From a paper:
By contrast, the integral membrane protein EzrA was identified as an inhibitor of FtsZ polymerization and its absence results in the inappropriate formation of multiple FtsZ rings, not only at mid-cell but also at the cell poles. EzrA comprises a single, N-terminal trans-membrane (TM) spanning helix followed by an ~60-kDa cytoplasmic domain15, which sequence analysis suggests forms an α-helical coiled-coil. The BsEzrA22–562 and the shorter SaEzrA24–214 rods comprise multiple copies of the same ~100 amino acid, triple helical bundle; BsEzrA22–562 contains five such repeats and SaEzrA24–214 contains just two. Although many proteins are known to comprise bundles of antiparallel α-helices, EzrA is, to the best of our knowledge, the only bacterial protein that is formed from serial spectrin-like repeats.
To obtain higher resolution structural information on EzrA, several fragments from different EzrA homologues were subjected to crystallization. A 190 residue N-terminal fragment of S. aureus EzrA, SaEzrA24–214 (that also lacks its N-terminal TM helix), yielded crystals that diffracted to 2.6 Å resolution. Its structure was solved by molecular replacement using model phases from the equivalent portion of BsEzrA22–562, and was refined to a final crystallographic Rfree of 0.25. The structures of SaEzrA24–214 and BsEzrA22–562, which share only 20% sequence identity, superpose with root mean square deviations (RMSDs) of 2.4 Å on 154 paired Cα atoms. Two copies of the spectrin repeats are also observed in a 2.6-Å resolution structure of a 20-kDa cytoplasmic fragment of EzrA from S. aureus (Sa), which has enabled direct molecular comparisons to be made between eukaryotic spectrin repeats and those found in EzrA. As also observed in several spectrins, the SaEzrA24–214 structure reveals intimate interactions at the interface between repeats involving the linker helix and loop residues. For example, the linker residues Tyr135 and Ile131 interact with loop residues Thr62, Leu56 and Tyr193. The angle between the two repeats in SaEzrA24–214 is 34°, suggesting that full-length EzrA from S. aureus will also have a pronounced bend. The first and third repeats in EzrA each contain a highly conserved proline residue in helix A; Pro45 of SaEzrA in repeat 1 is conserved in eight out of nine phylogenetically diverse paralogues, whereas Pro228 (Pro227 in BsEzrA) in repeat 3 is conserved in all of them. The conserved proline in helix 1 of repeat 1 (Pro45 in S. aureus EzrA) may confer some additional flexibility in the junction between the body of the cytoplasmic domain and the membrane.
Residue numbers in the entry: 23 to 216
Amino acid sequence: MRSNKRQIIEKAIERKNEIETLPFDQNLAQLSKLNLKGETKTKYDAMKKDNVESTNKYLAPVEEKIHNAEALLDKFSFNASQSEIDDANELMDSYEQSYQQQLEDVNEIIALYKDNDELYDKCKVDYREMKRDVLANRHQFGEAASLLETEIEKFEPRLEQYEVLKADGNYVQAHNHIAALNEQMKQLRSYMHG
């Protein structure tokens, strides 16, 4: 009966040895292909630390749970042995989950770099169009025109500011900055019907 309980244990050993090969680092190396500084580097550093905390909390203890399972089985402590394997699998479930959480955490960052640039491209174009609408239809706005020419000029430094924040790897401030800019350009454009 032990010989066929040993299969449960062997399946656990196969599972440990394969989850030791989850590409945590290949995942995180994707962040290096962006600007590895600022908030980006902070998140990269924090995730390396988590992997040490995860490795020691969830992976190191497994080996012993499996050794206890073998010893207990051998003495015919069948349920006790099964418990140690259940525990081992629970621990590996967490390690696996901590990987999944990092595919997701990094995907989020990739998505923000992409979406940050989408907004920036939109703001460049809108700026250009608004600046031209004023310079070519000055008369058509009446007296509210000089306030507009200077207010639209105030978007130009705010574009350059985005380039700086992005270049420093501050993807979060970059996003909040460019979203706010888009919002305000938007409301200024509604107003510009009249």
